[PDB]
Amino acid sequence: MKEKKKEIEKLLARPDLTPEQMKNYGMEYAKIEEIENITNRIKETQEFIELLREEGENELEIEKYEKELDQLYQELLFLLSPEASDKAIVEIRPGTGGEEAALFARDLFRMYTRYAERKGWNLEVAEIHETDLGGIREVVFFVKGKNAYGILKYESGVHRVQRVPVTESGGRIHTSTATVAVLPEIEEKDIEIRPEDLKIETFRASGESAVRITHLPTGIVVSCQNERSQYQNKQTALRILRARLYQLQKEQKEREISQRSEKIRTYNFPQNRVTDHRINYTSYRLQEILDGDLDEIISKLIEHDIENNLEEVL
Amino acid sequence: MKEKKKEIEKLLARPDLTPEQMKNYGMEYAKIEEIENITNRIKETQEFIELLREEGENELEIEKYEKELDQLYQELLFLLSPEASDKAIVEIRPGTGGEEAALFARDLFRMYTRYAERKGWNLEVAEIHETDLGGIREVVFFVKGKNAYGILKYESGVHRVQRVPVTESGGRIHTSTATVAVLPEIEEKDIEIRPEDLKIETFRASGYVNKTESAVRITHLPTGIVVSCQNERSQYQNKQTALRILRARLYQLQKEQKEREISQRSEKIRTYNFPQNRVTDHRINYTSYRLQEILDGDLDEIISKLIEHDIENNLEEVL
Amino acid sequence: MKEKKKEIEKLLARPDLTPEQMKNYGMEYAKIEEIENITNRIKETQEFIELLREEGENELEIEKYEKELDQLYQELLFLLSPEASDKAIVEIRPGTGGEEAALFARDLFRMYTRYAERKGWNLEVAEIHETDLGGIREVVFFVKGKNAYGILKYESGVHRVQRVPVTESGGRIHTSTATVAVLPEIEEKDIEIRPEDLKIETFRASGESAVRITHLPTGIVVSCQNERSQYQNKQTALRILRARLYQLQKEQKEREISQRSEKIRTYNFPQNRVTDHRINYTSYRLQEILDGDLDEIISKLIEHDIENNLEEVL
Numbered sequence: 037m038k039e040k041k042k043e044i045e046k047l048l049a050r051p052d053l054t055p056e057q058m059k060n061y062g063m064e065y066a067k068i069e070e071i072e073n074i075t076n077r078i079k080e081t082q083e084f085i086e087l088l089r090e091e092g093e094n095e096l097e098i099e100k101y102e103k104e105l106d107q108l109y110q111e112l113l114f115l116l117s118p119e120a121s122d123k124a125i126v127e128i129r130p131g132t133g134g135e136e137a138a139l140f141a142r143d144l145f146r147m148y149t150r151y152a153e154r155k156g157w158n159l160e161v162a163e164i165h166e167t168d169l170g171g172i173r174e175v176v177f178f179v180k181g182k183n184a185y186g187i188l189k190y191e192s193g194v195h196r197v198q199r200v201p202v203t204e205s206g207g208r209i210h211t212s213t214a215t216v217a218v219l220p221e222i223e224e225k226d227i228e229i230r231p232e233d234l235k236i237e238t239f240r241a242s243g244e245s246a247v248r249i250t251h252l253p254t255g256i257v258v259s260c261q262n263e264r265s266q267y268q269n270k271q272t273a274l275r276i277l278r279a280r281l282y283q284l285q286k287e288q289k290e291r292e293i294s295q296r297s298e299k300i301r302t303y304n305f306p307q308n309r310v311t312d313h314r315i316n317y318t319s320y321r322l323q324e325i326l327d328g329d330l331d332e333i334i335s336k337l338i339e340h341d342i343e344n345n346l347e348e349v350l
Numbered sequence: 351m352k353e354k355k356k357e358i359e360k361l362l363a364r365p366d367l368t369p370e371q372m373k374n375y376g377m378e379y380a381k382i383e384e385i386e387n388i389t390n391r392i393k394e395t396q397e398f399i400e401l402l403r404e405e406g407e408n409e410l411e412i413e414k415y416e417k418e419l420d421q422l423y424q425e426l427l428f429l430l431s432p433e434a435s436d437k438a439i440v441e442i443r444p445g446t447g448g449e450e451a452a453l454f455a456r457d458l459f460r461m462y463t464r465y466a467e468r469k470g471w472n473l474e475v476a477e478i479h480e481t482d483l484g485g486i487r488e489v490v491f492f493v494k495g496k497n498a499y500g501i502l503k504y505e506s507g508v509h510r511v512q513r514v515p516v517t518e519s520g521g522r523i524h525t526s527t528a529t530v531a532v533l534p535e536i537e538e539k540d541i542e543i544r545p546e547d548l549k550i551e552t553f554r555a556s557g558y559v560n561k562t563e564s565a566v567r568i569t570h571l572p573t574g575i576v577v578s579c580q581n582e583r584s585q586y587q588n589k590q591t592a593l594r595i596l597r598a599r600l601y602q603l604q605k606e607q608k609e610r611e612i613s614q615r616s617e618k619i620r621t622y623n624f625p626q627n628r629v630t631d632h633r634i635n636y637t638s639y640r641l642q643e644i645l646d647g648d649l650d651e652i653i654s655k656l657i658e659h660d661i662e663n664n665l666e667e668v669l
Numbered sequence: 670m671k672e673k674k675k676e677i678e679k680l681l682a683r684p685d686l687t688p689e690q691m692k693n694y695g696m697e698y699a700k701i702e703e704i705e706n707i708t709n710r711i712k713e714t715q716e717f718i719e720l721l722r723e724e725g726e727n728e729l730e731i732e733k734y735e736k737e738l739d740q741l742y743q744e745l746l747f748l749l750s751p752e753a754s755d756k757a758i759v760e761i762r763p764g765t766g767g768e769e770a771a772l773f774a775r776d777l778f779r780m781y782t783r784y785a786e787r788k789g790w791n792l793e794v795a796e797i798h799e800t801d802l803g804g805i806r807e808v809v810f811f812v813k814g815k816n817a818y819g820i821l822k823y824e825s826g827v828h829r830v831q832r833v834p835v836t837e838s839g840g841r842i843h844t845s846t847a848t849v850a851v852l853p854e855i856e857e858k859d860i861e862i863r864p865e866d867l868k869i870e871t872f873r874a875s876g877e878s879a880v881r882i883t884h885l886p887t888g889i890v891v892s893c894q895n896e897r898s899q900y901q902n903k904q905t906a907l908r909i910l911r912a913r914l915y916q917l918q919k920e921q922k923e924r925e926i927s928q929r930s931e932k933i934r935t936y937n938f939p940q941n942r943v944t945d946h947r948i949n950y951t952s953y954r955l956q957e958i959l960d961g962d963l964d965e966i967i968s969k970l971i972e973h974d975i976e977n978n979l980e981e982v983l
Binding site: 453456457460480481482483484513516517518519520521624642645646 | 864865867868869870871872873874877878879880898899900901903
Binding site: 139146161167169170199202205305326 | 584
C-alpha cells in the first residue's frame with residue numbers, strides 16, 4: 037500500500053519468520069496486489085472512456101465501461117475497508133409532508149427491495165406499517181449480501197422528493213421527506229445484554245402477534261406487531277435491539293462531545309433526476325434508479341471516499 | 351397518383367411556389383412513385399408465381415416469392431397509411447370456455463409476443479392477470495414499431511380455438527374463445543382530459559412486496575371509464591401507464607359514441623383448429639396449414655392476406 | 670443367413686408363390702446377400718491390415734482401412750439388428766460428484782451434439798436444466814438418422830470421468846459420473862395408452878410454459894418447462910413417455926427374472942484416454958472422441974456384438 041505498506045511485506049516475507057506469520061504476511065501481500073491491480077483497471081478503463089467521448093465523435097457505449105467502473109469501485113471498497121460488513125438492518129420513516137411523506141417512504145423501500153434482488157442479496161421484512169393510500173408509516177428490514185452494509189451505509193440520512201402528488205390532478209409540486217437509517221447487524225456473541233436488563237411484553241394484536249422489548253439500562257424500546265409467532269417475534273426484536281443498542285452505545289461514547297436540513301439526496305420527478313448532495317452528483321436516470329439501479333450513485337460515493345477519505349492519503 | 355393525385359403534383363411542382371412547399375410537394379412526389387413501384391413489384395411477382403404453378407411441372411418454391419408478397423404489401427400499407435400508426439395498445443381476455451378460454455388467451459399473448467420479436471418491435475406489458483393452469487385471465491400491453499398499429503389493427507375481434515385441452519387426456523375436442531382488442535395509442539396533444547374530470551385513488555396491494563407493490567385506479571368521471579392497475583410499478587409509474595390506456599380508451603369510446611348514435615355477438619374473426627393444424631381467418635376466408643408456425647409468431651402470412659384484401663377494395667383502392 | 674435362413678428362401682422362390690410374397694421373400698434374399706458380401710469385405714480388408722503391419726515395415730495407413738471397417742460394421746449392423754429405427758431419445762444426468770458430474774454431463778451432451786453433426790443426423794433438444802458454472806442438471810434430446818438408435822444404444826449406462834476440475838488450478842484428480850440413457854422412440858400406433866391412465870397437469874412458469882404428465886400405473890413422470898406452448902410441450906411429453914413406458918415394459922418382463930457399479934466407460938484427462946470397459950478397449954484420442962469422433966469406439970462395440978451376440982452363431 038503506497039509502497040511503504042508493501043515495503044514491510046517485502047522484508048517481513050524475507051527468509052525468516054514463523055509459519056503462522058508467513059501466511060499472515062504473504063496473504064496480505066496478495067491483498068495488496070488485488071487492490072493495486074483493481075485500481076489499475078479502474079484507472080485504465082477511466083482514461084479509456086475519456087477517449088470514447090471526444091474521439092471526434094463519441095461512441096455511445098462508454099456505458100458498458102461506465103458500468104464496469106461502478107463495479108470495480110465496489111470491489112475495491114470491499115478489499116479496502118476492514119471486512120465485517122455483510123449484514124444490515126434498514127429502517128425507513130416518513131418525514132415532513134404527511135400522506136405524501138409516507139408515500140415517498142414506500143418509494144424508497146421499493147428501490148431498496150429492487151436493489152437487493154439485483155445484487156443477489158437476501159431481504160427479509162422485519163416489520164411494516166402501511167397507510168390507506170398505499171404508503172408506509174414505518175418499515176425495518178434485514179439485508180445480507182457481499183458488502184450489503186458496506187454499500188447501504190451510504191443511504192443513511194434524510195431523502196427528499198419533489199413531485200406532484202399522484203392522486204392530485206395536475207396540482208402543484210410537493211416536497212416531502214423520508215428518513216433512512218442503516219445499521220450493521222450485531223451478532224449475539226459480539227455484544228452483552230444481561231437477562232435482568234430486558235423487559236419483554238406481549239399483547240393481543242390490536243384489532244398475528246404483538247411483542248415489545250425494553251432494555252432498561254438504555255431505555256431502548258423495540259415493538260413488533262407482525263405475522264411471526266410471539267417467540268419468533270422476540271428473536272426478531274432482539275436482532276434489532278442489539279444493533280440499536282450497540283449504536284446507542286457507540287453514540288453514548290462519542291456524542292457526549294459532538295455537543296436540521298441535512299438533506300442527503302433529492303429526487304425530482306418532473307426532471308427525472310437524482311442529486312446526491314454530499315458529492316453534488318446529478319443523474320437523469322431517476323426511474324431506473326428508483327427501479328433498483330442504485331450502483332451509479334453509490335459507486336460515485338465510494339469513489340469520493342476512496343479518493344479523499346480514510347483509505348486515501350492515510 | 352392514379353394519374354390524378356399525381357396531376358396536382360405535376361402542376362404544383364411547376365416553376366414557382368414557396369420553399370417549404372418544394373420539399374413538401376416534392377416529398378409527396380416520391381411517395382407516389384414508390385407506391386407505383388411496389389404495386390409493380392407485387393404484380394410482376396404475382397403474375398410470375400401463377401406461371402410457376404401450371405407451367406408443366408411446378409417448382410415448389412413459389413413460397414419464397416410468396417413470402418415477399420407479404421412483405422411488399424406491408425411496405426405498401428406503410429406508404430398508404432402515412433399518419434402515425436407506430437404505437438398500439440393491445441388487450442386480451444378470455445371469451446367463453448372457462449379455464450380453457452384463459453389458456454387460449456395466453457397462447458395468443460405468446461403469439462403476439464413472439465410475433466413482435468420477429469418484426470423487431472418493442473413490447474411492454476402494461477398488466478397481467480394469470481391463472482393457475484398457467485393461463486391468462488387478462489392482459490394489456492403496448493407495442494411500438496414501424497406501422498405496428500396498422501398491422502395489429504386487423505387482430506381486433508374474437509378468436510376461436512378447436513382442440514383437445516392439454517389437461518384433457520386425449521379426450522374430446524373443446525372450443526373456447528379469446529378476445530383481442532387493439533387500439534391506437536393516443537398522445538396528450540391529441541385528446542383533452544381536464545383535471546377536474548379525473549379521479550385518481552391509490553390503495554395498498556391486496557394480499558416484501560405484499561401482493562404486488564402498488565395499486566392505482568383512475569376514473570374518467572364523465573364517461574365512467576375506469577383504469578385499474580396492480581403491478582410491480584410504482585404509483586407514479588402506474589398512473590402514467592393508466593393515463594396512456596385511458597387516452598386510448600376515451601378516444602375509442604368517443605368514436606363509438608358518435609357512430610353508435612346513428613347505427614341503431616358472434617363476430618368470430620378467426621379460427622385456430624389444432625387437429626387440422628390450420629388457421630382460417632373468417633373475414634377474408636383465407637386458410638393456412640401452418641398453425642404452430644403461426645402460433646409461434648410467423649403471423650405475416652395472415653395479416654398480409656388481410657392487407658391485400660383491405661387495399662383491394664377499401665379506401666386505399668377505389669379512393 | 671447361415672446358409673440355412675437362405676435355404677428356405679431358395680425353395681419359397683421355386684416355381685410358385687404370390688405377388689405380395691414374391692417381392693417380400695425376394696428382398697430378404699438380397700438383404701442376406703448384402704450381409705454376406707459385407708461380412709466378406711470386412712473379413713478381407715482385415716486380413717489385409719494385419720499384413721500391412723508385420724509386412725517388413727508397417728505402412729502407417731492401416732488407418733485408412735481401419736476407418737473403412739468402422740463403416741462396414743455399421744452397414745452390417747444396419748442390415749442385421751431388429752428394425753431398430755432411425756429415431757432415438759437420449760437422456761443425460763449427473764451421477765456422483767456434485768457440480769463436476771453436472772459439468773461432465775454437458776461434456777457428454779457436447780460429444781453427441783458434435784457426433785450427430787458428423788453422421789448427418791438431425792437433433793432437437795427436448796429440454797435442458799442448466800448449471801451456473803455451465804453444467805447440465807438434466808437433458809433429453811431427439812436424434813434421427815439411418816439407425817441412429819442402434820449405433821447409440823451402446824451409450825446407455827454410467828460414464829465416469831477422472832480429471833482435475835477446470836475451475837481447480839493444478840489440484841487433485843477428481844472423479845465423477847454421468848448417466849446416459851438411450852431409448853428407441855415409439856410411435857403412438859405402436860403402443861396402447863388408455864386415457865384413464867394419464868394425469869396431465871399445467872402450471873405458471875416459476876421465475877414460458879410448464880407441463881407435467883403422469884402415467885398413473887407405472888409412476889413414470891415427464892416434466893416440461895420451456896419456450897414452447899403448453900400444447901407443443903404436451904406432445905413433446907407424450908413422445909418421451911411412450912418411450913419410457915415401452916422400455917419399462919420390455920424391462921418389467923425381464924427385470925422379473927434377472928433376480929450398482931455398472932461403470933460403462935472411463936474418460937481420464939491427464940492420460941488423455943477413453944477406455945470402454947465392456948470390451949476393455951482403450952483409445953488415446955480422448956479429445957477427438959469428446960469432440961464427436963465416436964465411430965472408433967462404437968464400431969468396436971458393434972464388432973463384439975456381431976461376434977458373440979445373436980447376429981453370430983445364431
